[PDB]
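Handout for the seminar on molecular recognition.
Each group receives one record of this type.
Step one: identify the two inputs.
Step two: read the structure output and locate the region that could contact protoporphyrin IX containing FE.
Step three: write two sentences on what you found, then compare them with the reference statements printed after the record.
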Amino acid sequence: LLSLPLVGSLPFLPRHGHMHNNFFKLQKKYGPIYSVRMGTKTTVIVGHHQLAKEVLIKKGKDFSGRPQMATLDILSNNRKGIAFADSGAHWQLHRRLAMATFALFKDQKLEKIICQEISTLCDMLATHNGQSIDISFPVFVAVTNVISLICFNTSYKNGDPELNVIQNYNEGIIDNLSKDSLVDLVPWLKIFPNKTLEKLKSHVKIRNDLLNKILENYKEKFRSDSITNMLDTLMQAKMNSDSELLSDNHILTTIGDIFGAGVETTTSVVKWTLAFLLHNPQVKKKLYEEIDQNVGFSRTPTISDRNRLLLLEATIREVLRLRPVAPMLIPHKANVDSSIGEFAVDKGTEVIINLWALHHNEKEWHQPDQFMPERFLNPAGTQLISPSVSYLPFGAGPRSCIGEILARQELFLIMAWLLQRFDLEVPDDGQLPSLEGIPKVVFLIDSFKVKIKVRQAWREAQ
Ligand code: HEM
Ligand SMILES: CC(=O)[C@@]1(O)CC[C@H]2[C@@H]3CCC4=CC(=O)CC[C@]4(C)[C@H]3CC[C@@]21C
């Protein structure tokens, strides 16, 4: 009796469980690296830090490409900008210029931009004293203004409805960019009739029309005697012509990515962090203790307080380990024939770093499924440590994050100001937020509510 002919085989069920974890599980059987073939495209998944750091650092330039996807094409305006651009003259240029802008805020000192918007954030939330709210939007607004000040030296006032229009198309872009993660085994959208690409174009259209209107008004304001933000930095480079690489759509898309990443990543990590603290009251109590001890109520927190607020800095590290924004980074592509761990990797092959597998490796972490900020501390709790090398929340090499500094400061300051001033409790229905998460292009958390009350100790101190 014979075996049925086999036209196709996949090692697990499509759309069942999170991709990054299904890949991780396969490693017990196939080892830390393996490949899957879709028609002609071959995809290699890496789940070990030594191999990951080969792909990202030791051979960074080799694997610095991006694959082409229908949805990403629409959002990136055919592979322009930075994040979804292939490695090339345009990518390198805009990446450089974008990185260069960050210099213009080193001592408009970045900390003062951030703390400005946090103060407003905390004043908003004080009004909700005694109520249970979703804190998504108020935080969205804060970081939106920071990135806007950095990009255009403009910020939105309370009640500007353009903020809600931005919130709307950001949710829509994310919803349709990918069903779950960016890594789909089966290309379903090319198979069955669906309105997915249509919907994406509509959110992206609105986002684009809005950015054109910011550029055109700004062409009047631009003066080479003043370079204070990203758009100046980009218009300056243009007039020094590379001219093909700095067209209006090229500039637009780059700001697009920066605006996108600067808001959706930090907002998500704030919501995830609050969520973990709701589930872990002991840690939260010790966070209050810590900040009461080392900051008190005499002033508002500052970047210098990272030296003192070590438990907080560790909590932040731990959330980025447990719930990385991008548990599989953004996909990479081999630009040339190369290798990984002495296995051959052909040019044009897709290479995915399973950061989830790195962050949950049992041999690299003690109880990796557990929220344990202590792990980034010495036993005494007197300084931060780096307990595993299998830890790359911001990536590494050519394609590494370029907002890590901005990111880390935003996260630290927001959490510090909030804990200084607010009791953050489980809402009256006693519902806790599911920590399972929702894997989109960003690893999101189900929306949830938190009971906010101004701190008794903060009150007295007035
Ligand atoms: C807050 C937590 C954040 C995390 C965990 C994070 C993480 C990452 C990761 C994993 C990548 C891709 C790595 C790869 O593909 O090899 C990336 C790329 C990128 N990030 Fe961040 N990010 C964060 C915040 C930010 C912020 C605040 C900005 C502000 C501008 C930003 C801008 C970018 C850009 C433009 C890229 C694409 C770089 C390229 O492809 O050349 N990110 N980030
Ligand atoms: C988590 C990461 O590493 C990445 O941060 C680096 C680039 C980020 C894209 C940039 C373009 C964009 C525009 C929007 O308005 C929706 C938000 C996105 C999709 C935004 C999400 C997080 C991304 C994918």
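Reference statements: The chain has one domain: 1-462. DSSP finds 15 helices and eleven strands in the chain.
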